[PDB]
Amino acid sequence: IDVSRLDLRIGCIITARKHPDADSLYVEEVDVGEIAPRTVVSGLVNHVPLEQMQNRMVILLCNLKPAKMRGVLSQAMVMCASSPEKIEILAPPNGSVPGDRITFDAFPGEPDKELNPKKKIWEQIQPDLHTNDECVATYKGVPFEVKGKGVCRAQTMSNSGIKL
Numbered sequence: 001i002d003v004s005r006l007d008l009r010i011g012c013i014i015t016a017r018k019h020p021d022a023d024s025l026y027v028e029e030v031d032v033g034e035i036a037p038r039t040v041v042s043g044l045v046n047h048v049p050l051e052q053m054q055n056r057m058v059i060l061l062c063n064l065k066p067a068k069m070r071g072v073l074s075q076a077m078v079m080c081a082s083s084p085e086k087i088e089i090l091a092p093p094n095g096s097v098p099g100d101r102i103t104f105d106a107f108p109g110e111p112d113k114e115l116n117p118k119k120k121i122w123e124q125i126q127p128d129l130h131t132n133d134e135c136v137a138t139y140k141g142v143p144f145e146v147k148g149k150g151v152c153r154a155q156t157m158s159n160s161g162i163k164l
Contacts, residue, residue, distance in 0.1 A: 001124050003139040004109025006164075007063035008079070008102035009033065010092050010146060016053035018045070022070040026053060030076065032060055033099015041074040047087040057092050059102060059137075059144065059152055061164060065117045081131045081154035081162055088157045090137050093150025100146045104139065122164035129162040137162060 011032040019025040024045055029037040040060070044053070060076040067074055081088045092100075115122055128140045135154045137144040144152035154160065 007111035010100040038075040041069040081157035081160040
């Protein structure tokens, strides 16, 4: 089981607001290159000011089974570097386009249509997901890259885990 099972894509947060029925969460509408934006619910209120959530490029895990979070069905998850004392949104390289896929020549494969909730194979992948010494996001040391644009990275969190 390697990273090829995950469907990682670039997205642009079109709109972001406090979740109407869960003030500790944000609800974002994200353009991920599909016909319609995906609704995403993120617990980033205590880590990123709302102003900095607007029109922001991010990396999303797109094949997790959608789940509700207070009457709000979350359809993807924003990839972040994290620790018990901080969370940082991973930044795609300049010029990334919604829908761009993060793939690895070292780990060839097509992502699952939907990660089976039962089994949770992402728990087996997460341990090898971390930013390196230079804050670049990696899977087993191989950088998250957008073909022809560059690598994805956290702002200050080095050697930090990336949760799924």
